[PDB]
Amino acid sequence: SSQANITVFDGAATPVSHVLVPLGVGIDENLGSVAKWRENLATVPLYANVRVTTMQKKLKSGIERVEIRVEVPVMEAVSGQNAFGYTAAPKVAFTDSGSFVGYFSERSAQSNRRLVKQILTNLLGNVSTSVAAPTTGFASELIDSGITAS
Amino acid sequence: SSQANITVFDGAATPVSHVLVPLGVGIDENLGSVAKWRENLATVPLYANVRVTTMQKKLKSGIERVEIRVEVPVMEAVSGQNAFGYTAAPKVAFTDSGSFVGYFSERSAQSNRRLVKQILTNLLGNVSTSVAAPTTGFASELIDSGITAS
C-alpha cells in the first residue's frame, strides 16, 4: 500500500523495461484519490515521461469508480532549424493512453472485483488458460480492495 | 478478425473457465463499431450472463477510442417466498464492470498502441519482468490495429 518503484516492460517488438518512480498521492475534487508514478529519463523533458496514475472516486450514484491510466508521450523529431535560425525545442507529438476502468457497486466484494479484473487481463494477454489473479501489488490493492497508495 | 468462441479464466480464488460465444457485430451511433460475446449458462437468465464487448469510435477531436468491456452480473439469492406467496423470479443484484479504454491519435502506429497496451496488462498482473506483447487475438486486433471482429 506504501508507494514504491514500479518496474514494468512495455509492448515493443523487443519489450523495454521502464522504472516508474513515485511522485506522491493526494485528493482531487474531480478525480478522487490520485496516486502518480513517473519514469525519470534524461532523454526526454520531465513532463514527457512515461507515467502511471490511479484514480478512485465514489460517484453520485454510489458506484465506486477506479482507474489505472498509463500514458506514453511520443516526441517530435527535431531536425535542422526552424524559420528563426535555431534548433527547435523538444515538443510532444502525441500521448498514447491506455487505462483500466472499473465500476463497482458498494455491495461488490474483494472476490467479485478480483474475478472481473482477471477476465480483462487474460483477454488483453490473449490467454485462454488458467491464471491466478494477483492478490498483492498496487493494481490489486486498487481494483480488488479500493486502496490507494501512500 | 472473424468472431470466435473465447475461453477465459476469471479471478476467483480458484479461477473458473468461461466460454464466451459470439453474438454478432454492428455499428451504433453512440458507441461506434460494437462486437459482443456472451456466455450461455443455463444457471442464470440469458441477459444475466458474463459478457465481453468491444467498442471502437473516432471522436469529434479525431482521437480514436477503443474499449474492451467485461461485465459480470451477480444474482440475488432467492429464498423462501415473497409477500404474494410465490417463489421470487431471478433478479440481478449488481453488475461488476472492468474495461480497457484506449485513446490514440491518428498518428499513433500499431507499435505505439501495442507498447502502451502491455504496460497496463503487466501492471494489472503484478508483473515486473519482460512479457511479449500479443500480436494476435481479438484484443490485439482492436487495441493495436483498430480492428473490430466480424
Place this chain on the structure above:
Amino acid sequence: SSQANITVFDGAATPVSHVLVPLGVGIDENLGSVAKWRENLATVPLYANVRVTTMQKKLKSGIERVEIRVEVPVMEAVSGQNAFGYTAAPKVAFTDSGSFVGYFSERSAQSNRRLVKQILTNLLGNVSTSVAAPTTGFASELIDSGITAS
C-alpha cells in the same frame, strides 16, 4: 455460432437435399439481427433460389421475437431457348414462405424456450412419440438461446 453451409432435405414426394450457403449478417432497425442463407444453383436466378433467414428483435414490450423464415420461390414455365443469344429463366410466379416464430419473455430460460420449440416441431412432423430436443445447431442457438449467426 458463425455462419456455415446448411444441408436440408425438402418435403417433396421424393425428398431432395439443398445446400444453403451463407449470404451475410447485419442489423436492420426494423427487422433486428438478420442472418441470411441461400442455395446457389448455377443456372437458377438468384431470387428464385431457396433461401433461409433468421430475425431476432426485442420489442417494446420486452418480449423477444424470433423467426426462422424458409422461402421457396417458384418460377413460371419456360417457352424455349434462343439459338444464338443468352436466354433468361422466367419470372418468379410466387414464393412460398414457411417460418417458425417465437415470442418469449425475458424470464423464460433455455429450457422453457426449448420445451415449446419441440412441441411445434413434433406437431409439424406428425410425431406422437418422444423426441429429444436439439441443443446445438443454428435453430437451437436462435430459438433456445437467442443467439444469431455471427
Place this chain on the structure above:
Amino acid sequence: SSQANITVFDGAATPVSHVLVPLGVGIDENLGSVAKWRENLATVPLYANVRVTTMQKKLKSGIERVEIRVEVPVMEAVSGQNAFGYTAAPKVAFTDSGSFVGYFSERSAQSNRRLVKQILTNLLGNVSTSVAAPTTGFASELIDSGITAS
C-alpha cells in the same frame, strides 16, 4: 379433418407426453378460421393448460396466412404462505409461444406447401438426412392443404 385428440411429447430434458383435447372451432374478425386444443391436467387450472391453436386467414392479393400456435404457460412455484396466511393461488409466471407461420399464394399446390413445410421441420430438428413429409394429421391438413378442423 375433424377435431380429435393430439398426443405430443415436449422438449424437456426428459420429454413429457401431453394429450390435447379439442376445445372448439370458430370464426374471428381479425384471426380467421380458428381451431383450439388444450390439455386437461388436474395440476393447473383450466386456463393455465398447454394449448394449441390454428389460424387460417385470407389476406389481400390472394395470399393466405396459416399459423399453428403452441403456447405453454409456465406456472409460478407456490411455496409457503402469502402475507395473509394462506397458500397462494396458482399464477402464471410467463407464457412461452412457439408457432409455425406460413404465407402461401392461392397459386401454390399441395406439393409446393408440403415441400416447404418439411425443410423447416428438418431445420428445427437439426436433421440433415432425408425424412418423409407427413401427408396426414392436423398440421399437414392445415399447412399442406389449407384445411381447418371442423
Place this chain on the structure above:
Amino acid sequence: SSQANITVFDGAATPVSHVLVPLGVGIDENLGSVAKWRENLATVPLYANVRVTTMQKKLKSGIERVEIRVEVPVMEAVSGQNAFGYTAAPKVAFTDSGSFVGYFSERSAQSNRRLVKQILTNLLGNVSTSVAAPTTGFASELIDSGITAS
C-alpha cells in the same frame, strides 16, 4: 464466405505483394452491406493503409448494386524539416480509387453474373485468350453470387 486475409500483388513496375487483414463488417444507411479489409504496414499510420471494401445495396425495380473498391493512399514524401524545425508528420498526398461496379437484376443467375465478370477482368488484363472464371474467393462470392463476407 466469412472474412479472411487477402494477398494481392499491385501493378507497380516491379509488383509488390500486399496482405489485407479483415477490418470489419457493418450495415450502412446509404451504402448497404459493407465489408472492409486493410493492410497493416508499419510504414504508414493506420488510416493511410491500402484498403479494400465491398458494398451490396438493393435498389428499386429489383436491381442490386455491387462494388469492390480498392483505395491506395499515396503519401507525401517527408524530406528535411518544416518551418517549425521538426520532421513533418506523415500526410496523404492523394488517394487513388479503382473499383468494380456491378448492376445486376434479381433475375440474373450465378452463371450470368460470372460470365460478365470475366469479360471485364480479361479486358483489364489485356487478355484475348481463354481464361477460366474463378468460382471461389470473396470477389466471386460477391459478384457471382451476391454474397457479402460475415
Place this chain on the structure above:
Amino acid sequence: SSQANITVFDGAATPVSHVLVPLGVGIDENLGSVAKWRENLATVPLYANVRVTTMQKKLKSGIERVEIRVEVPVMEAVSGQNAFGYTAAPKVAFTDSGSFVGYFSERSAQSNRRLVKQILTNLLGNVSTSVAAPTTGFASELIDSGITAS
C-alpha cells in the same frame, strides 16, 4: 489509340470468345468522352448483343473519373417461329453490368494508376501470385494514361 475490334472470352463454364466491333466515339456533356463497342451476332437484336463502353470525365473536384462498362443483355425465351412471315427475337429480360471505375487525382502518375488497376484485376481473377500489369491495350490507355479511343 483508335478503335479496333476487341476479342474477349467470357466467363461461361466453357468460356466463349466474343468479337466486339467499334460503334463510335463522341463527347457527351454528362458522361464525358465515350467510346462504344458491340458484338455483331447476325440474328441477335442489336440491343441484346454484348457491348463495351468507356467513359472519361473530369469532375468538379478535379478528380478524373474513368469507367470501362461491360453489359451483357439476356433475352426472354422463344415460343416458336412463324411459318410465313418474319419472326422477332424476344425482348431483353435484363442486362448484367460489370464495370471498372477509377477515381484518380491529377497528381497520380501512370505508375500510380497502373498499380491500383492490377490489384483489382488480380482480385477479380482470384490471383495471389505476381502478374505483370499491362502497359498497352485500350484498357491501359484509359486507366493508366487517361486516353480514350479516337
